[PDB]
Amino acid sequence: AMRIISVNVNGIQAAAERGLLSWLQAQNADVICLQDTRASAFDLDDPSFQLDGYFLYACDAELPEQGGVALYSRLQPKAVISGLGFETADRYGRYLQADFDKVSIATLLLPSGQSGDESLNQKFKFMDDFTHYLSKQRRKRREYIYCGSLYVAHQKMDVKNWRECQQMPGFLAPERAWLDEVFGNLGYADALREVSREGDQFSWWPDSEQAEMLNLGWRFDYQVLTPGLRRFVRNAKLPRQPRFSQHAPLIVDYDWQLSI
Amino acid sequence: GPAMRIISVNVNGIQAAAERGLLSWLQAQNADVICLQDTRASAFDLDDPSFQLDGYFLYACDAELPEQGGVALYSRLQPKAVISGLGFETADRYGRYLQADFDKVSIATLLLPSGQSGDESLNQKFKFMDDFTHYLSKQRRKRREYIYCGSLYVAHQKMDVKNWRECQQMPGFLAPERAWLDEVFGNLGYADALREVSREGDQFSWWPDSEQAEMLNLGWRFDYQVLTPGLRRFVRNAKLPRQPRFSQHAPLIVDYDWQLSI
Amino acid sequence: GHSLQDPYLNTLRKERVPVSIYLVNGIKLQGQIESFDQFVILLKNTVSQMVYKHAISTVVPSRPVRL
Amino acid sequence: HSLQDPYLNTLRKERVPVSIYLVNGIKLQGQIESFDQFVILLKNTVSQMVYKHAISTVVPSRPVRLP
Amino acid sequence: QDPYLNTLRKERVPVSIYLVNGIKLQGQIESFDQFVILLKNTVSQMVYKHAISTVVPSRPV
Amino acid sequence: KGHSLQDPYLNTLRKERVPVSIYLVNGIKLQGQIESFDQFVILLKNTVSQMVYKHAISTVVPSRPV
Amino acid sequence: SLQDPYLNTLRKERVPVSIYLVNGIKLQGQIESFDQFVILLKNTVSQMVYKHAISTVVPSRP
Amino acid sequence: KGHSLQDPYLNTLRKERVPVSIYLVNGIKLQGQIESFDQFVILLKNTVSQMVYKHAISTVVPSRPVRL
Amino acid sequence: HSLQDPYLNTLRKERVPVSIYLVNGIKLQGQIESFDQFVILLKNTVSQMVYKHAISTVVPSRPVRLP
Amino acid sequence: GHSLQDPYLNTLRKERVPVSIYLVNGIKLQGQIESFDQFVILLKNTVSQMVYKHAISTVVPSRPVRL
Amino acid sequence: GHSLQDPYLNTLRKERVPVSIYLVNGIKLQGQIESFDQFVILLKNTVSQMVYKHAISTVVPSRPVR
Amino acid sequence: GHSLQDPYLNTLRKERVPVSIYLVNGIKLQGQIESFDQFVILLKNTVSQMVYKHAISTVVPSRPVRL
Amino acid sequence: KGHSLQDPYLNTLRKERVPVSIYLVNGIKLQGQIESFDQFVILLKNTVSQMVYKHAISTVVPSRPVR
Amino acid sequence: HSLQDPYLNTLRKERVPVSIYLVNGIKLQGQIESFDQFVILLKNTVSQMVYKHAISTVVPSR
C-alpha cells in the first residue's frame, strides 16, 4: 500500500475545531500533507496536532496568517527540506519536502490569486519561478510526488459552467496554459485523471450553502507526480466531507510501497 | 420463479463419493451449480466419463500430488471462463482454488487445508488464511461479485458447534481462526447465506468419523458461502439435509434469487 | 530464425500443459494450447478463443516442462 | 497462414456471433462480415472497422469446429 | 482495407475513430494512405494507422 | 510510396513552422514546433530539443489551419 | 545486432537479470536460450516471452 | 532508414557521450549515455548496460544542448 | 384487440423467444414474462420493460399458429 | 371515419398481394398480409411477424389493386 | 375537426394537382391523390399506395391551389 | 381551442411575421403562416404548401412577438 | 389526474427562472427559461422567442435541482 | 393499465437504478423520483424530467 492525503485546512485551528485531527487519526494513511497552517512552527509543536504514530514536520511563513504548511509521516523521512530559493517561496514557507528512499514527496501551496490583482501577479511570478525550478528538476533521478493545491483547473472536465469562470481567476488562459505545459511537455502526469477519467469531481467549492447545494466546485488539488510513479496508481477518491475543509480531502493510493 | 440451487460437497476423495453413489444423487439433484472439493485425484482420474454429469461441464484443478487435494466444479451452463491458482504457493502448488466466471458473478471454489492432521498443516492453514484475506482485499477491488464455495474448516461461533468447551483447543474454534473469520466477516462486510436465511442452531456440516458423534449430532459448520453483500440480499433459503453422510462434510444446499447466465 | 519458439510451443501443446498467457494488459488466460501458427495461437478454453501473437506477451506454464 | 484464415472463414460462413476484445480490453460484439490480412469488419448495429493490430483475442459465443 | 476507407472518404460519411488509447475522435475523412489518415475537423488532425483501433461510421455504406 | 500523404503534410508543417501539439499513445500532450522529420522520427524544438518516435505518436493537432 | 551479443553474454555468465516488460512488471531470472522471436528465461517456471513486447533487459550485477 | 535522420542524431549523441533521458512508453525514465545502437536496440551505460528496445522508446530528451 | 390478445397470449404461454425490433432499427432479444395493454415486460437475464410506442415489429424466431 | 382502411386491407388480404412495406426506419418489409385489426397487422412471410400500425409509413401493393 | 384539411384535400383531388409528399423519414414520394379518408390516402402513381397521415410531414403541390 | 396555442397562432397570422418551422427530423421550413386549423397549418410562400401539426417540432418567429 | 405532477413542477421551474437546457427528441440542445405553458405548447424565452411542442420534447434539464 | 404501476413502484421502493434508452439510442441511468401518465423524473446530476412517450426500453441494474 501507499496512501497520500491532501487537506488544505486553511487554518489548522479551524480544522481542529472541525474534527480534522480525529478524522486523520482514524484515517489510516502513510503521509498527510495539510496546507495553510496559518500558524507558527511553535504552534504546530502543540502535541494536540501530533497524530499518534506519525511524525511532526512544519514550516511557517514569515507572517503566521499568511500561510504555512505542515507534513506528517508514518515513518521517519530520510531528510526534510524547505524553500526553493524564490522570495515568494522562502519568505512564506509555501514549500516543504521530505525525503524517502527512491521517492521523495513534497507539499506545495500556491497563492490563491483570487483576493486581489497583486495576488494574481504573485501567482504568475511563482508559476514562472516554479516551472523554471522544475526544468532544473528534470534529469533528477529521485522521483517526486508534488502533492499541492495549485488553485488552477486543467480542463473543463475539472470544473462546470466554465463559460462563467473563464474570466474569473483560477481558470484564466495563462494559468491553464502553464499547467498544461508543466504536465504534458515535461512528461508529468496525474494519478486521478489517469486512474479515473470521471467528471464532476471537485475539491474546493464556496462555503456558501447555495454553492454546496448546487455543487459549484473548482478542482484545485492535484497529485503532481513524476512519470516514474505514473504506473503505480491504484485509485483516487474525493470524499464529500461535510464542510470539514474548503479543499475536500484528496486521498490516493499507490501500488509502490515506501522504505526508509 | 427465479431460483438458483448452488450445491457444495467436500467429498474428501471423489472415489469414496462414487462408492457411495454420490454421482447418482447429484445427477438426480439437477441444480444450477455443483462443487466437489477435495477430489484427491488428478484431472486424468476425473476424466473418467463416470464422474461427468450429463448436462454439465467438468472443470477441476489437481494438486501437485493427486491424493493431496484437488477440487472440481460442475456447472449446468457453460461458465464464461474457468481459472485456477491464486499466486500463492500454498494455493497453486495444491490446486486449492478454482473459479468459474459467468456474468457479473464468479462462483469460486476454495479449499482451505484441514489443519487437523498435524501442526505443520495448521501452520500452512494460518499462512493460507493470511494470504487469502490479502487476496480478498486485492481481488474484490475489481468490479465483480464473488460466491466463495469453500470449506473453511473453521466454526465461527458457538452456534456452529456444540460442547465447544471441549473444542476450544480443537482445530476449527482456535482463537486465531475465530479472530480471522470474524475480521473477514465484519471488518470486510462479508456475510454468509445460511446464517442470514436461518439463525438456527444445531445446524452443522462436518461430523467426526466416530458413529457416536453422528448419532448425538456432534457436528461442525465448516463450510460457508461467504459472498459480497451485494448478492447477500438475494439469498432465498438454506438447507443441510441429514441424509446418510456422503462425506466428512454434509450436503450444503442453498437457493438464491439470482439466476446465472453466460 | 524462428527455430526456438516452434519446438517450445509444439512441446507445450503435445503434453497439453496448462499455460497462463499474461496479456500486455495484465489479464490472465489459463488454458491449454490446442494449436499455433503465424500471428495466432489456439487456446483450449471452454470456448477455444483464438488469440493473436502481437497482443500476447508472456507464456508461463504452471508446471515446468522439459525442452 | 494455415490457421487464422480457415478459422476466420469458418466463423464468417457460419455467421457465429463472436465477441472481440481490444488490446486495451474494451469488449466488442458483432458478426464477422469479411476478413482481411490487416483488418476486419464487425457488423453490430453499425458496421465498425476494427484493426487487427488492436485485437487481443477473438471469443466465439458458440463452440466452433475446424475443418 | 483500401476500398472501405476510400468509400468512407468519398461519400463524406461522418466518422468517429476510437484510438488505441481509447480517445473518441470525431471528424471527416480528408485523405488516407498506408500509414496516415488525415481527419478534417476544424483542423487537419492527422491520425496514424498503427494507433487506430475502430472506425465507427455514423451510417452503414 | 509509404508517406505519399504523410511526407507532404509534415514538410508543409515544417516549412510553415506551425506550433503543433503531439498527443502520444500514452496520452501525454506534447506542444512545440516541428523542427525536422524522416521515416520514423520527428524533431520537436522547444525548451528542450525533443525527439519523438513516430511509432508512439497518436495524433498531432496544429494550432492553426494549414 | 548488439542484442545477440548482450543476450548470449548474459547466458554464458548466467547473470541474474531483471527484465521490464512493456507494461512495466519487473521480471527476474537468468536467460537460458534466445532467438530473434522469443526468449526462454531460466526462471523457476521459465516463462517464455516474445520479442515484440520487450522494454529493457538489465543485469542486477555489473 | 531511407532518409535516416535518426542516424546523425544518435551518432552525435554517442560521439559526444551526452547525458540522455530516454523516456519509455510505460512511463519510466532511463538516465545514462548512449554507448551504441543498431536497428532495434540502444545501449545505455549507467554503471551497467541497459538493452532498451527501440519500439518502447517514447521520447529522447538530451539534458545537454547538442548543436547540429 | 381481436388479434393482439390471442397473439400475445400464445407467445407468452409457449415461451417463444421473440426478437423485438425497435423503431430505430436495433434488434433486441429475450423472453417475454408478461404483457400489458400498453407495455410489455421482456426478460433477458433481467426483466426489461419495453414500451409498445418504441416497437416496430415483433418477429418470433419460431412459427406460431393462432388459436 | 376509417371507411377506407377496412376495404383496402380486406382487398389486400383476400387477394394475397405482396407488399413491400417501407418501415419508418427505412427498411422494406416484403410479404403478404395475413390479418389486421385496430393498430395491428399480421404478415405472411417466413414467419407470422406482427407489424404495428403506428410504425408503418406506406403500404405499397406494387401490383395494381382496386377497391 | 379537419375544417381546413378536408377542403384542401378535396380541392387537390378535384383539380388533380400532382402533389409531392415528403415523409418524416426522408424518403421521396410522388403521385397525385386519387381519394382520401380521415387516416390513409389513395395515390395516383403507378403503384397507388396507401400513405399514412401520421407519417406524412409536408404536402407541396406542383401548382398553388385555393 | 387552446389557452395560448390558438391565440399564439392567431397573433402570428395577424402580423404575418416570417416564421421558420422546424421539423422533428431537423429540416427547416421558411414562409409565413397563411392559415391554421387543428392538425394542419398552411404556409404562404412560392407555393401554398401545407404542413402537418403533429410533425412540427418548434415554431420560432423571426422577430420577438408577444401574444 | 393527468397533470398532477408535471404542472406544479414546471410552474415552480418557471417561477424560479432557473436556466434550463431542454433536449429535443432529435437530440438538439436548446437553452433558455420557460416563461409560459399550458397543455400542448411550451413557450421558451431567450434571445429569440421560441415555441416548442410538447410531443417533440425528450427531457427538460434545468441547471439546478428544484424541489 | 394493470402491469406498469406496481412494477414501476417496486423499481423505486427497492432503490433500483433504472437505465432508460432514448429513441435516438441515448442512454441515461438514474433513480426514478416520481412518475405520471406522461412524465417520469430520473435522478441524475439534476432533476431531469423524462417524457414517457420518449422512452424506448427500461433496463434496471437488477
Give the DSSP letter string of A243-258: SS-SB--EEEEESSPP
CA-angle at A71, arms to A35 and A259, nearest 5°: 140
Experimental method for this entry?
cryo-EM
- What chain H holds in terms of domains, given with CATH numbers, is 1-68 (2.30.30.100)
Q: Considering Cα of A156, then A158, then A160, then A165, what sign does the dihedral take?
A: negative
All cell numbers assigned to E37: 489518415
CA-wise closest residue to A96 among A46, A31, A151: A31
Provide the residue type at I49 as one letter.
M
Q: Which residues on neighbouring strands pair with residue A98, listed in sequence order?
A: A80
Closest-CA residue of chain C to G33:
C4
Cα dist from A78 to A68, A259, C36, D28, whole Å: 22, 10, 53, 49
Rg (alpha carbons) of chain L, rounded to whole number = 11
C20 vs B contacts (CB less than 8 Å): 85
Provide the residue type at E48 as one letter.
Y
Range list of H helices, chain B: 14-19, 22-28, 43-46, 89-92, 119-139, 175-182, 193-197, 211-215, 229-232
Are the CB atoms for F55 and F40 separated by under 8 Å?
Answer: yes
Cα dist from J44 to I6, I59, I61, J49, M63, whole Å: 17, 12, 14, 7, 51
Q: How far apart are CA A95 and CA A99, in angstroms?
A: 13
Helix axes A117-135, A173-180, angle to 10 degrees: 10
CB contact under 8 A, H27 and A138: no
- What chain B holds in terms of domains, given with CATH numbers, is 1-262 (3.60.10.10)
CB contact under 8 A, H48 and G59: yes
CA-wise closest residue to H46 among H35, H59, H62, H57: H35
CB contact under 8 A, F31 and A187: no
The DSSP string of I39-55 is EEEEEESEEEEEEGGGE
Are the CB atoms for C56 and C9 separated by under 8 Å?
Answer: no
Q: How far apart are CA K24 and CA L25, in angstroms?
A: 6
Evaluate whether chains A and F are touching (3 or more beta carbon pairs less than 8 Å apart): yes
The three-class DSSP label of residue A213 is helix
Residue identified by cell 432499427 is: I25
Element (H, E) at L44: strand L40-44
F41 in H contact zone (CB under 8 Å): yes
Provide the residue type at E37 as one letter.
I
Compute the 3-state secondary structure of chain E and give helix, strand, coil in percent, each to the nearest 5: 15, 50, 35
Best residue in A163, A164, A214, A216 for a mutation probing chain M (most M CBs within 10 Å) = A214
CA-angle at F21, arms to F16 and F25, nearest 5°: 135
Are the CB atoms for G17 and G4 separated by under 8 Å?
Answer: no
Cα dist from F39 to B83, E35, E41, F29, H55, whole Å: 44, 11, 26, 22, 14
CA-wise closest residue to C62 among B101, B83, G51, G40: B83
Q: How many CB atoms lie within 10 A of CB A158?
A: 23
The dihedral formed by the CA atoms of G48, G49, G51 and G55, expressed in degrees to the nearest 10: -130
Neighbouring chains of B at 3+ CB pairs within 8 Å? C, I
Please give the distance of CA B3 from its chain centroid, rounded to a whole number: 20
Q: How far apart are CA N26 and CA A230, in angstroms?
A: 34
The three-class DSSP label of residue F5 is coil
Q: How far apart are CA G62 and CA A147, in angstroms?
A: 36
Q: How far apart are CA L60 and CA L1, in angstroms?
A: 21
* Residues of chain M with a following break (C to N over 2.5 Å): none
Are the CB atoms for B5 and B235 separated by under 8 Å?
Answer: no
What is the Cβ-side half-sphere exposure of residue F30, based on CA atoms within 13 angstroms? 31
G59 vs H contacts (CB less than 8 Å): 48-49
Q: Considering Cα of A164, then A168, then A173, then A176, what sign does the dihedral take?
A: negative
Q: How far apart are CA B135 and CA B85, in angstroms?
A: 11
Cα dist from A180 to A145, A155, A174, B227, H25, whole Å: 17, 9, 10, 45, 19
CA-wise closest residue to D65 among K64, L45, C35, G35: C35
Are the CB atoms for B260 and B106 separated by under 8 Å?
Answer: no
Rg (alpha carbons) of chain D, rounded to whole number = 11
Longest dimension (CA), chain E: 27
- Pairing type for strands B106-111 and B146-151 reads parallel
Q: Considering Cα of N23, then N29, then N35, then N39, what sign does the dihedral take?
A: negative
CA-wise closest residue to B11 among B53, B41, B33, B52: B41
CB contact under 8 A, E56 and D36: no
Report residue B260: phi and psi, to 5°.
Answer: -75, 155
Are the CB atoms for J47 and I19 separated by under 8 Å?
Answer: no
The three-class DSSP label of residue I19 is strand
Neighbouring chains of M at 3+ CB pairs within 8 Å? A, L, N
Query: From the annotation, which residues of A make up the binding site for Mg(2+)?
Result: 8, 247
CA-wise closest residue to B38 among B57, B80, B66: B66
User: Of the candidates L8, L26, L64, which has its C-beta nearest M41's C-beta?
Assistant: L8
Q: How far apart are CA N56 and CA N25, in angstroms?
A: 9
Cα dist from A107 to A22, A69, G36, J45, whole Å: 21, 7, 48, 74
Q: How many CB atoms lie within 10 A of CB B155?
A: 27
Q: F64: exposed, middle or buried (C-beta count within 10 Å: 0-12, 13-18, 19+)?
A: exposed
Please give the distance of CA B137 from its chain centroid, rounded to a whole number: 20
All cell numbers assigned to F21: 501539439
Residue F59 CB contacts under 8 Å (≥ 6 apart), including other chains: E19, E23, E25, E45, E46, E47, E48, E51, F22, F23
Q: How far apart are CA N26 and CA B146, in angstroms?
A: 31
Are the CB atoms for F13 and F62 separated by under 8 Å?
Answer: yes
Q: How many CB pairs under 8 A join E and F?
A: 61
Element (H, E) at A104: strand A103-109
Provide the residue type at B8 as one letter.
S
Range list of H helices, chain A: 12-17, 20-26, 41-44, 87-90, 117-135, 162-165, 173-180, 191-195, 209-214
Cα dist from B79 to B136, C18, D11, whole Å: 22, 18, 21
Residue identified by cell 522562502 is: A90
Q: How far apart are CA B82 and CA B59, in angstroms?
A: 7
Q: How far does I45 lie from chain B, in Å, by closest CA?
A: 7
Q: At CB < 8 Å, which residues of chain A contact H?
A: 138-139, 141, 187, 189, 226-228, 230-231
Are the CB atoms for I57 and J29 separated by under 8 Å?
Answer: yes
Lateral strand order in the sheet of H41-46 = H34-37, H41-46, H48-53
Q: How far apart are CA K53 and CA L50, in angstroms?
A: 13
Residue B187 marked in a binding site: no
Structure resolution, Å: 4.5
DSSP type of residue B187: I
J39 in K contact zone (CB under 8 Å): no
All cell numbers assigned to C19: 499455460
- Pairing type for strands G26-29 and G17-21 reads antiparallel
Q: How far apart are CA K61 and CA E26, in angstroms?
A: 40
Are the CB atoms for I10 and I32 separated by under 8 Å?
Answer: no
